[PDB]
Motif scaffolding. Sequence first.
Motif, PDB file in Angstrom:
ATOM      1  N   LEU A  26       0.832  -1.193   0.000  1.00  0.00           N
ATOM      2  CA  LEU A  26       0.000   0.000   0.000  1.00  0.00           C
ATOM      3  C   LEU A  26       0.870   1.249   0.000  1.00  0.00           C
ATOM      4  O   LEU A  26       2.008   1.232   0.472  1.00  0.00           O
ATOM      5  N   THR A  27       0.333   2.328  -0.559  1.00  0.00           N
ATOM      6  CA  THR A  27       1.026   3.609  -0.612  1.00  0.00           C
ATOM      7  C   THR A  27      -0.014   4.715  -0.658  1.00  0.00           C
ATOM      8  O   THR A  27      -0.970   4.630  -1.433  1.00  0.00           O
ATOM      9  N   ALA A  28       0.165   5.739   0.170  1.00  0.00           N
ATOM     10  CA  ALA A  28      -0.767   6.855   0.227  1.00  0.00           C
ATOM     11  C   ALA A  28      -0.006   8.112   0.610  1.00  0.00           C
ATOM     12  O   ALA A  28       0.869   8.068   1.474  1.00  0.00           O
ATOM     13  N   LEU A  29      -0.340   9.227  -0.032  1.00  0.00           N
ATOM     14  CA  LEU A  29       0.357  10.483   0.194  1.00  0.00           C
ATOM     15  C   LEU A  29      -0.623  11.639   0.095  1.00  0.00           C
ATOM     16  O   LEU A  29      -1.541  11.614  -0.724  1.00  0.00           O
TER      17      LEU A  29
END
Lengths: 49, 49
Positions: B19-22
């Motif tokens: 997962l990746t969130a920014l």
Amino acid sequence: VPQLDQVVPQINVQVRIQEVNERALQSLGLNWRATFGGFNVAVSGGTGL
Amino acid sequence: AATFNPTQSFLGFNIFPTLTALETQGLTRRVYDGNVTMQSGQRSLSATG
């Protein structure tokens, strides 16, 4: 001639130049990494979750 | 991107996620306030060096 040969005023002129600059900075950041069973979580400022 | 291999066979099910969130925000301000004192029929000055 009497009018073109008269005394003209003499003056003194004062000029003042001022310049003031101010700054202020404030940084704050937490940067962690948690590892529990199977999972690996990393939170930073550059990249997010 | 799916493939099939008829010669081998994996054991069980594996999922291997990631997962990746920014999120980001910014705000820049820049202000100038200039006064000049002058006359009505004022002409330009030619110095220019």
